[PDB]
Paper text:
The DXO/Rai1 family of proteins consists of mammalian DXO and fungal Rai1 and Dxo1. DXO enzymes are capable of removing the entire cap structure by hydrolyzing the phosphodiester linkage between the first and second encoded nucleotides, releasing GpppN from unmethylated capped RNA (GpppN-RNA), and they can release the intact NAD+ from NAD+-capped RNA. A single active site is used for all the DXO/Rai1 hydrolytic activities, which are mediated by binding of the scissile phosphate to two divalent cations (magnesium or manganese) that are coordinated by conserved acidic residues. The eukaryotic DXO/Rai1 decapping enzymes can eliminate diverse 5′ modifications from RNA, and here we show two additional activities for them: release of FAD and dpCoA caps from RNA (deFADding and deCoAping).
A structure with strong electron density for FADP (but not FAD) was finally obtained, at 1.6 Å resolution, by soaking the compound into crystals of the E192S/E234Q/E253Q triple mutant of mDXO. Glu234 and Glu253 are direct ligands to the metal ions in the active site, while Glu192 is hydrogen-bonded to a water molecule on each metal ion. FADP is situated in the active site of DXO and is in a folded conformation, such that its adenine base and flavin are π-stacked to each other, at a distance of ∼3.5 Å. The N3 atom of adenine is hydrogen-bonded to the side-chain hydroxyl of Tyr189, and the N1 atom is close to the side chain of Glu97, which is in an ion pair with Arg177. The carbonyl oxygen on C4 of flavin is hydrogen-bonded to the side chain of Arg95 and that on C2 to the side chain of E234Q. The N1 atom of flavin is hydrogen-bonded to a hydroxyl of the ribitol group, which is situated above and contacts the generally conserved Trp131 side chain. The pyrophosphate of FADP interacts with the conserved Arg132 and Gln280 residues, and the distal phosphate relative to adenine is also hydrogen-bonded to the main-chain amides of Gly133 (at the N-terminal end of helix αB) and E234Q (a ligand to the second metal ion in wild-type DXO). The 3′ phosphate group interacts with the conserved Lys255 and Gln280 residues, as well as a water molecule occupying the position of the first metal ion. No metal ions were observed in the active site of this structure. The binding mode of the pyrophosphate and the 3′ phosphate group of FADP is similar to that of 3′-NADP.
Residue numbers in the entry: 27 to 384
Write the structure that this text describes.
């Protein structure tokens, strides 16, 4: 029993995808402590329209003002489960809504969406059904762990530069001014909790949101959110084409799911300065590849993801939070399934299971 991933199998009409609704949010502070509020949300504050163009030094502060979170601390779904546990009797959708839902991180859904086009990096997703609800939690592959531990200094600094860009673009208060003089502490995060549905599969998922734009005409989340990105400056049409084909696919997938309507990109030069800014509306990203023989097709992304959810739902018959069906995928093959009990794959914690059962 396996699931093929080739684009040609999934190029029919765009499937049903429910307009996402924000159910709530949560924040992680500088000590990685959870707070069920928006204290970590910051506010879009781009360079003033009359002043100079951007010239953001994305290396400033690296590494002495860098407090990276410990990537060896395993969190899986725990922060999302805390939100669900604390809102389980306040959830919209009527009686039994959660029981028919699939609960996961937005980023896990993104990797599903990009699978038909992914040539380099495989994935593993652990699945457990508990009180009807299907939980999906990513598992770091052996190869991914090796690459992480061997991360080159350049990529460590590049990751810093991505976080640093937000500090130049965002303020702590609406209408405030960015203050890049502080630390980059990657324990800090703001997460939106969203309800959607793909095909016949209701979804509850959380996703990190970079900022809210107080100048946006629509103030209702997620319509007011902006995602921030950096990417190399491009000079030739061929470079733009490669960017549309490969980078925009992942940017589109990531912001389409939570209904974030704009991605603002800072283009950085080889010396690590952002000297150009461009806004990419999410609903217009596909226009750059629509008549492109080597482009991507949002319908393929969503139809494959729907097929995976149907496959996972039919595969995971047993309701048991200690049982895991591990879905494994590598470029050039189908998604395959193996079954495991308890450690190390089981990921629903007793504090969640015991509260929900009582
Ligand atoms: C071994 C391991 C270490 C991880 N360490 C982190 C971490 O230190 N911080 C974190 O936020 N998530 C980390 N994750 C991923 C989390 O488990 C979880 O999937 C994610 O944080 C859920 O938030 P989403 O918004 O759904 O994640 P996504 O939509 O995938 O990405 C949103 C943002 O998360 C950051 N991020 C996502 N994945 C990673 C990663 N593998 N390593 C470092 N940063 C990442 C990054 O800022 C990214 O922005 P950008 O896309 O511009 O690069 C790690 C996963 C594994 C397997």
């Amino acid at each position: 029993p396996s699931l093929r991933t080739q684009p040609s199998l999934y190029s029919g009409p765009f499937p049903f995808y429910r307009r996402p609704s924000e159910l709530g949010c949560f924040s992680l502070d500088a000590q990685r402590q959870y707070h069920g509020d928006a204290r970590a949300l910051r506010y879009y504050s781009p360079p003033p329209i009359n002043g100079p163009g951007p010239d953001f030094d994305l290396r400033d502060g690296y590494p002495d003002r860098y407090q990276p979170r410990d990537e060896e601390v395993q969190e899986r779904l725990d922060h999302l489960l805390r939100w669900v546990l604390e809102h389980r009797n306040q959830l919209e959708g009527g009686p039994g809504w959660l029981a028919g839902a699939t609960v996961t991180w937005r980023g896990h859904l993104t990797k599903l969406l990009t699978t038909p086009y992914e040539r380099q990096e495989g994935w593993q997703l652990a699945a457990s059904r508990f009180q009807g609800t299907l939980y999906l939690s990513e598992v770091e592959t052996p190869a991914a762990r090796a690459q992480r531990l061997a991360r080159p200094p350049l990529l460590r600094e590049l990751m810093y530069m991505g976080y640093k860009f937000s500090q130049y673009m965002c303020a702590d208060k609406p209408g405030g001014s960015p203050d890049p003089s502080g630390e980059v502490n990657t324990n800090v995060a703001y997460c939106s909790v969203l309800r959607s549905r793909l095909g016949n599969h209701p979804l509850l998922f959380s996703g990190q949101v970079d900022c809210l734009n107080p100048q946006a005409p629509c103030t209702q989340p997620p319509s007011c959110y902006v995602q921030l990105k950096t990417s190399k400056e491009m000079h030739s049409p061929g470079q733009w084409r490669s960017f549309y084909r490969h980078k925009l696919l992942k940017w589109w997938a990531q912001s389409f799911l939570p209904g974030v309507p704009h991605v603002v990109a800072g283009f950085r030069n080889p010396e690590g300065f952002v000297c150009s800014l461009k806004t990419f509306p999410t609903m217009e990203m596909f226009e750059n590849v629509r008549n492109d023989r080597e482009g991507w097709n949002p319908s393929v992304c969503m139809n494959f993801c729907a097929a995976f959810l149907s496959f996972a739902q039919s595969t995971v018959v047993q309701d048991d939070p200690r049982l895991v069906h591990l879905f494994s995928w590598e470029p050039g093959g189908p998604v395959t399934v193996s079954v495991h009990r308890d450690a190390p794959y089981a990921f629903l914690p007793s504090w969640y299971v015991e509260t929900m059962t009582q």
